């Protein structure tokens, strides 16, 4: 799994891959890991599918009740706090890394990270899942604050493509959603139009020379392609 | 005259007689010649037949030891065959351990070392063969000879066996910088037909091999039509 969320000027972008696997076999190649918690607040889910589905549903139930009781739309910080409490009270019996992100008019676009263990950290961007390890350096080199909404969608699509080209446990579609004061905008990129993969990178077209033909010299040239 | 019974004893004059006697077996054997062109190396040898009923290829004196190198034996053939096995093992060791085709100069020095060790110990005798080594690896075309003493040298052209004194005379009238591998086969075969003694040895044939650019630096017998 590869998940992330990034803040921009006046909102957030969430992104993910679409693969669910038992280790070496793909059970679903088109999962949806961006889960809605309220009109402008979403989470990204990693770890056990069963545990994350169950805690997202419970968090959403509590936010809907709260919103009816106050007659106002909820803030991102309230969703993060409710979710944190469920992750922390159940930490020994679950496998879950969560990112909560969204837009509200008090604080604008906000991103919170809730990793294994149940801590809660407020950031400018967050990464999660098996594929995150491949992206720390990509962001350290190429991320800046103050990107526009279109810059930020394009950047997150590229980041997800890099992680899934190297991580065997990630793959498939790239899903994104952008949250701001207007309406939410979702997008799905198919593998055939991915912005990066190893299979089409020209520096990996020519094969390594592992199988040189039997020769009278120690010079290494080409791979054998036909029987002698 | 007890000093000539084993190879582990010097004589008073500083000689090792068992090794000299082994050399006399090579000098009484059939003649061989070889030449180093700019392309490659060519070897040719006379086979004395003992019967008119032999198959072709019987008692071959020339043997491949790697893709790019070969050996020709003079003197006693079964002794030569023990050296061929050793040489095959050294060429394989070089490919397996060092990932190279064995250079010609290294192959010749290992063959020399192996032959020398049988001139040192009371329980073994010296080999009764001299070996011609022909190679074309990353050090270019190379032709060497190793004798029963284990002495090793490099040559442009060489002759061995009972016709060698005359054959040497005729190799000295060749031009080694200029000659190609197709000319060489004609000249070398001529020398061997001329020194053959028709009284003593009635039946004979010639065996010829090469390694050159034409062959892709593969050591092989020449096709029987080019004689």
DSSP A67-118: HHHHTSPPPHHHHHHHHHHHHHHTGGG--EEEEEEEEETTTEEEEEEE-TTT
Which of A178, A174, A144, A145 lies closest to A159, judged by CA? A174
Using CB atoms, pick whichever of A214, A216, A218 lies closest to residue B99: A218
CB of B106 less than 8 A from some CB of A: no
- Closest Cα in chain A, distance from residue B187 (Å): 27
The neighbouring-strand residues paired with A28 are: A20
B137 inside 8 A of chain A by CB: yes
How far is residue A211 CA from its own chain's centroid? 39
3-state secondary structure of B195: helix
Instruction: Please tell me the experimental approach by which this structure was elucidated.
Output: cryo-EM
SS3 state at B187: helix
Find the angle CA(A191)-CA(A193)-CA(A199) to the nearest 5 degrees: 70
CA-CA distance, B47 to B207, in Å (whole number)? 7
**Alpha carbon B127 to chain centroid, angstroms:** 13
Give the count of beta carbons closer than 10 Å to the beta carbon of residue A56. 21
Rounded Cα gap, residues A19 and A21, in angstroms = 6
Comparing CA positions, the residue from A176, A194, A189 lying closest to residue A11 is: A176
CA B173 to chain centre: 21
Spatial strand order in the sheet of A125-128? A125-128, A3-8, A11-16, A174-179, A185-189
A210 contacts on B by Cβ (under 8 Å): none
Residue B136, both tokens: 């074309």
Min Cα distance B112 → chain A (Å) is 23
- Are B7 and B155 contacting, i.e. CB atoms less than 8 angstroms apart? no
Query: In Å, how far are B26, B117, B163, B184, B187 from B190, measured between CA atoms?
Result: 22, 37, 13, 10, 5
B217–A contact, CB cutoff 8 A? yes
DSSP code of A133? G
Per-residue burial over A187-222, b = 16 or more CB atoms within 10 Å of its CB, e = otherwise: eebeeeebeeeeeeeeeeeeeeeeeeeeebeeeeee
- CA–CA distance, B176 with B105 (Å, rounded to integer): 20
The tokens for A2 are 């590869």
CA contacts within 13 A on the Cβ side of A43: 27
Chain B CB contacts of A219 under 8 Å are 138
Chain CA centroid to CA A13, Å? 10
CA dihedral B217, B220, B224, B227 (to 10 degrees): 60
Tokens 């070969």: give the residue.
B70
- Residue B197 and residue B161 in contact, taking contact as beta carbons nearer than 8 Å: no
Cα of B101 to nearest chain A Cα, Å: 6
Residues of A marked active site are found at: 1
Q: How far apart are CA A111 and CA A114, in angstroms?
A: 10
What are residue B182's phi and psi, to 5 degrees?
A: -90, -35
Instruction: Give the number of residues written for chain B.
Output: 227
Number of CB pairs, chain A paired with chain B, less than 8 A apart: 20
Query: Cα B28 from chain centroid?
Result: 15
- Do B138 and A215 make contact, defined as CB atoms within 8 angstroms? no
Question: Is residue A128 within 8 Å of residue A44, measured between CB atoms?
Answer: yes
User: Is-contact B134 B34, C-beta < 8 A?
Assistant: yes
Residues in contact with A192: Cβ distance below 8 Å, sequence separation at least 6, in sequence order: none
Resolution in A: 2.2
State both tokens at A142: 């190429």
Residues of A in contact with B136 (CB under 8 A): 216
Which residues of chain A does B217 touch, with a Cβ-Cβ cutoff of 8 Å?
216-217
Mutation for testing the B interface, residue in A209, A214, A216 having most B CBs under 10 Å: A216
Chain B (54-73) residues lying within 8 Å, Cβ to Cβ, of chain A: 67-68
Helix (H) or strand (E) holding B136: strand B129-137
Q: Which helix H or strand E contains A54, and what residues bound it?
A: helix A49-70
Residues 6+ apart with CB under 8 A from B39: B141, B180, B181, B212, B213, B214
Question: Helix, strand, coil: what percent of chain B each, to 5?
Answer: 30, 25, 45
- The helix, strand and coil proportions of chain A, stated in percent and rounded to the nearest 5, come to 35, 30, 40
What distance in Å separates the CA atoms of residue B32 and residue B216, rounded to the nearest whole number? 24
- Locate the chain B residue with the closest alpha carbon to A214: B67
Given a contact cutoff of 8 angstroms between Cβ atoms, the answer to whether A128 and A46 are in contact is yes
Residue A218 has its nearest CB partner, among B100, B217, B218, at B100
Report the alpha-carbon distance of residue B61 to residue B45 in Å, rounded. 8
Of A212, A218, A174, A221, nearest to A194 by C-alpha is A174
Query: Which of B39, B67, B98, B106 is the mutation pick for testing A, counting most A CBs within 10 A?
Result: B67
Using CB atoms, which residue from A216, A218, A219 is nearest to B136? A216
Distance between CA B108 and CA B226 in Å, rounded? Answer: 29
**Per-residue tokens: A131:** 């594929």
């Amino acid at each position: 799994t590869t998940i992330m969320a990034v803040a921009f000027k006046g909102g957030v972008v969430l992104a993910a891959d679409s693969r669910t696997s038992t280790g070496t076999y793909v059970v679903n190649r088109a999962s949806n890991k961006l889960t809605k918690l309220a009109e402008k607040i979403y989470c990204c889910r990693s770890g056990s599918a069963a545990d994350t589905q169950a805690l997202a549903e419970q968090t959403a139930n509590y936010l809907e009740s709260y919103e009816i009781d106050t007659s106002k739309p909820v803030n991102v910080t309230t969703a993060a706090n409710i979710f944190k409490k469920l992750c922390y009270m159940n930490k020994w019996n679950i496998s879950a890394g969560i990112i909560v992100a969204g837009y509200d008019p008090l604080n604008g676009g906000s991103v919170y990270s809730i990793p294994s263990g149940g801590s809660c950290v407020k950031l400018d961007y967050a990464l999660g899942g098996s594929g995150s390890i491949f992206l720390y350096s990509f962001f350290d080199a190429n991320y800046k604050t103050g990107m526009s909404k279109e810059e930020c969608v394009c950047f997150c699509q590229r980041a997800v493509a890099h992680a899934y080209s190297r991580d065997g446990s990630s793959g498939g579609l790239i899903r994104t959603i952008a949250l701001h004061q207007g309406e939410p905008e979702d997008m799905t990129i198919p593998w055939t139009k991915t912005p990066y993969c190893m299979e089409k990178d020209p520096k990996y077209r020519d094969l390594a020379v592992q199988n040189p033909p039997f020769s009278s010299s120690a010079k290494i040239t080409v791979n054998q392609s036909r029987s002698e | 005259t007890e000093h000539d019974q084993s190879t582990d004893i010097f004589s008073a004059d500083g000689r090792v007689f068992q090794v000299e006697y082994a050399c006399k077996a090579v000098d009484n054997g059939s003649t061989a010649v070889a030449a180093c062109c700019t392309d490659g190396v060519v070897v040719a040898v006379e086979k004395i037949l003992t019967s008119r009923m032999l198959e072709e290829g019987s008692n071959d004196r020339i043997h491949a030891v790697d893709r790019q190198a070969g050996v020709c034996i003079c003197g006693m053939l079964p002794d030569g065959r023990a050296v061929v096995s050793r040489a095959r093992a050294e060429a394989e060791n070089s490919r397996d351990v060092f990932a190279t085709p064995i250079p010609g100069s290294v192959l010749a020095s290992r063959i020399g070392e192996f032959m020398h060790v049988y001139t040192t110990h009371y329980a073994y005798r010296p080999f009764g063969c001299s070996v011609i080594i022909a190679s074309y690896a990353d050090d270019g075309p190379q032709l060497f000879v190793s004798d029963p003493s284990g002495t090793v040298a490099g040559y442009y052209g060489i002759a061995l066996g009972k016709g060698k004194t005359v054959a040497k005379t005729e190799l000295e009238k060749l031009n080694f910088k200029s000659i190609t591998c197709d000319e060489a086969v004609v000249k070398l075969t001529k020398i061997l037909h001329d020194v053959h003694d028709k009284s003593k040895d009635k039946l004979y044939e010639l065996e010829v091999a090469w390694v050159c650019n034409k062959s892709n630096c593969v050591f092989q017998h020449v096709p029987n039509d080019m004689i």
